[PDB]
Amino acid sequence: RKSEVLAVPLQPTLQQEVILARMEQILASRALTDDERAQLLYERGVLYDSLGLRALARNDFSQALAIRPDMPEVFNYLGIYLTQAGNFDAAYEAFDSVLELDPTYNYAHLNRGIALYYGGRDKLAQDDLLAFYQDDPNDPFRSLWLYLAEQKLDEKQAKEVLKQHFEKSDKEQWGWNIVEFYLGNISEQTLMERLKADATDNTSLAEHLSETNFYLGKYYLSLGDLDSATALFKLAVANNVHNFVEHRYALLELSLLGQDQDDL
Amino acid sequence: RKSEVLAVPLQPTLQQEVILARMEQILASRALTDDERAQLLYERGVLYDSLGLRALARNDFSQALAIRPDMPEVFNYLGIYLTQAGNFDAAYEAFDSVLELDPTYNYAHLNRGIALYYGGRDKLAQDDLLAFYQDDPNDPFRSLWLYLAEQKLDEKQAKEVLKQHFEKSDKEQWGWNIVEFYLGNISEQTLMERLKADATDNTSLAEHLSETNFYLGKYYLSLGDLDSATALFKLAVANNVHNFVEHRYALLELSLLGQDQDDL
Amino acid sequence: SSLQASQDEFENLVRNVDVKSRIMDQYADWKGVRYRLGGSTKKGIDCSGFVQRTFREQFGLELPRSTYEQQEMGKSVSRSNLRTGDLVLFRAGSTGRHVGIYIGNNQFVHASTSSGVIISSMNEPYWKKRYNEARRVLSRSHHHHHH
Amino acid sequence: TSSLQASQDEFENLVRNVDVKSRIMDQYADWKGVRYRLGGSTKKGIDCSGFVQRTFREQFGLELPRSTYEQQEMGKSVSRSNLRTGDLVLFRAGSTGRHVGIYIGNNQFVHASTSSGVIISSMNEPYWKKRYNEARRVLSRS
Amino acid sequence: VKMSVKTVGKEKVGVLDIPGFYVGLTDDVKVQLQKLEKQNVSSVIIDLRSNGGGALTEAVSLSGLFIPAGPIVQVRDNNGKVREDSDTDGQVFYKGPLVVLVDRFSAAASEIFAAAMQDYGRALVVGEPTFGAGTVQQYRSLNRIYDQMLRPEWPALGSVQYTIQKFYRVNGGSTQRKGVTPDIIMPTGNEETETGEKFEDNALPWDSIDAATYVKSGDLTAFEPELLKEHNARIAKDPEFQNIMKDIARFNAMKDKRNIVSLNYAVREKENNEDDATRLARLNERFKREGKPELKKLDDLPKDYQEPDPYLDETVNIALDLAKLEKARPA
């Protein structure tokens, strides 16, 4: 029911492919220690993840873990993939392992919160996301995810908490505009125009569109507009920025919508 | 200024990733002949291409050629990549090598035509694409490319030849609907509704949307509507079907439009 | 260029170095050096020059020379979540600003005017009273930004 | 106009030289902080020319001569605007007359200076910016 | 490959004879025109007589010796993209004033060389208007990688040279039809020669793209009255320039009925004796002028080298007066 901004879907950069080829060459050779093997396996998994090759990424991560079992970042990526796959208990366990090997890896809190939120444990998700918000309150996406969690508990209270978060922030980072739309403060047209204004190149435009379309899909889904939600989630995942949590969980929301459509 | 159909952008399948992992494993081993090595390199390049990793695909193809220099399919892919890169003379030469090693590889004609079409040799492109049309006149996209070529020579004659081709076909393949829109016979809404009707799963929808959005972008580009053309090309490339010529040359058209915008 | 960027990203990904150990190497190589305003040598050094040389020779970050310019580098961070390798800014000194490098357990290495370059505790009354801000410049890994 | 734009030869060149900085940094990590000593070729004490020789021999296999003066005539001259990692950067130090270092990118070069031993330094530093001479490329492989 | 740069005569004024723009011409001339940067420079000359163009990268590597890192030539394909080729390795090694002497049968790369120096204003253009070639060709082999494998009985395959690009000067103009008009015109060049690019079949048209970015050293290209009237005095003060003008007048008289020649053995023997007597008279005049014994019979004198070039002598005089100016024009 509205015209939308569009970006050129992101294509793999030359750097990614050159580095992946060199990594294939180096991992092919035997002359490298096991610590270096696990390091390169984790780096190649990260590169695969950035390219959307999540099975290859999880494979390289699992091998790096089978070499070095004390790698929290590998546990983090494995938990993210378990969340995407819908195995939430295993994701909880992986993020627990992350915090056990390193309790300062705060993003583990965020990821575990998202896991619990898609699992249905809204209270624990609220706890984790509130911790993450406490780590940095001016980050608008932290408040956005905290609101997404709390909305499953009390909608009015969640909106009021979101408004308070926005008011107490410095309001410097662009994402707060999304929050503003969530608070009934700016029209969607003004949101899209500020998006167009804040984007410099095609990649930044793709980032903006990915996150914004994900949150707008969540918004229109909360209001019961299934079609708008599906379209916004498709437009988000169309930006081909596979490392964003918005991208992953937009794919997840589309999967859940397909499941709901299949089961009568 | 119009509502559009949307598909879930294609994600790499599990089969692709297991095949790529086993290919890495096999190429890692020494127990392989040079013929089998070049075969596996060509297959892995094909898989990279299907995944949109075109530099890695070109690397594997070049290595397979450095092993066996009598591989016409490798020359075909290399010429396609030269077209995408804008080096049209080298593309001509690669396709010449394709036809020299095997003159029955008919699709090479099409590709060289497209190259010549994007090169500016509209007459030679017309020759090649008309040959490809002669190989099978009922394929609607052959007639579409022939029309795209002939439009640079005589607009009225090209449209009339396209109408004649459409009348002379069996009109059995869905693509002719695009042709019908090109002939002012069905509304764009009817085109999109027939598209929705002919698509069964998400992948067929993505294919349909890719092809149709590419041809519609070309259409609106010929009429001087730059914005609609850019939007349609972006919506085409958003389907993530990296194996379609429509996808590649939609990216190419977007690149050319960006080039025209940059130099004042 | 392109080769330059690719090589830089490759070096960044391959290096799994230990920030604390490298900063301690710089400290051991530099412990006890006298304090000198506008000095960038072992003959005499200032806090800002020590921070610049440390982050340049142990990692590769070309930080500016003045404390005033350094204070605007990187992204600000809070005391509760402070990591090793972050630079801590105090509101003291001849010019009003002082720089140190946090090394863990409420400790920071810095070129103080008293007895030269030394390790000191964040919990000491003088520095606890004279704290300003803290910023992180040794980043973890950021591909695409959320904008 | 993204990845395919770079030719196949340029792609192979990128894959073959993408680790040059990484190798030089490996040498630096194994060798950082070693004292300066004239005519020294060991971790007990080394000079700029000896460090360059050991680095280019152990990381790439290129056996350059021993003196800075001979290295200055080795390889092929290169201009300041287009200098890559692994090229030799020459300063007019004058303590022995010349000074040699290894450029690593972003106006930075690894070298064994007489003041603080083997370290990374910036081309934009006043001392080195004022006292720059020529540059030579020796890793001929592309 | 001789490198004898000595201050002999009045200045280090030398003549460089180039037979062709060889791929190794830079690699062998760098022994000649490099080692004089710190020391004192002089007005030397570069002669591009009867030149054949070999390579463009070499032309740019050789033309970078006299110009400190600057665009030497612009290239344009059939699409419209313009590229300025310049080797970004090395400053002006030879910081001396330079005179270029060029004839009408010169190479295209030599035209690029002379055009670079003329638009930069650093050298002086002397000689005859060049041939006028402005097209860049590609030389490619006709061998595929699969030829050796599956056609072993084939011999070596030919090669091709086809015009891919068109070259232009940094001033924006081209030399595809108008050539280069030098500041110092020669007598043998004043004749309307029936040779050049115009009389070649299917020669390309002329087009002037916009001017490049370049630092011009004084607008002495359009205003050369200082040496112009000096060398006009020199050519009117010697009978060699006059005899050559008489030769070109004979050309301008014979070219009326040049296409159809009449063969009467009487008048043919007449003109043969006329030419032999005129050659003997000119040889006796130059012998009296130079103090060498006069020749009387054609049998004692074997086949030897005649006078090489008086226009090189006028270029040396031009370089002398250029050094005179540089001594009197530092302000």
Author numbering:
A (entry chain A), B (entry chain B): 25 to 288
C (entry chain J): 22 to 168
D (entry chain I): 21 to 162
E (entry chain D): 345 to 675
Text from the published report:
To understand how NlpI enhances the efficiency of mMepS proteolysis by Prc, we determined the crystal structure of PrcSK-mMepS-NlpI at 3.5 Å, revealing that two monomeric PrcSK binds to heterohexameric NlpI-mMepS to form a 2:2:4 heterooctameric complex. We also examined the stoichiometry of the PrcSK-mMepS-NlpI complex through simultaneous SAXS and UV–Vis absorption measurements. The results showed that two monomeric PrcSK molecules bind to heterohexameric NlpI-mMepS, forming a 2:2:4 hetero-octameric complex measured at the eluent peak, with a confidence level exceeding 90%. The NlpI-interaction domain comprising helix h1 (residues 42–56) and helix h14 (residues 488–494) of Prc involved in interacting with NlpI can be well defined and almost identical between the structures of PrcSK-NlpI-MepS and NlpI-Prc-K477A. Unfortunately, the ligand-binding PDZ domain of PrcSK is poorly defined in the density map of the PrcSK-NlpI-MepS complex, suggesting that the ligand-binding PDZ domain is highly dynamic. Moreover, in each PrcSK, we observed a co-purified peptide at the proteolytic site, with the unidentified peptide represented by a poly-Ala model. Overall, this study advances our knowledge of how NlpI recruits multiple MepS molecules and reveals the essential structural details required to understand the mechanism of NlpI-enabled MepS colocalization.
Outer-membrane-anchored NlpI associates with hydrolases and synthases near PG synthesis complexes, facilitating spatially close PG hydrolysis. The protein level of MepS is known to be regulated by the periplasmic PDZ-protease Prc (or tsp, tail-specific protease) in complex with the adaptor NlpI42. The structure of NlpI in complex with MepS provides molecular insight into NlpI-interacting endopeptidase colocalization, while the Prc-NlpI-MepS complex elucidates the molecular mechanism of NlpI-mediated MepS degradation by the tail-specific protease Prc.
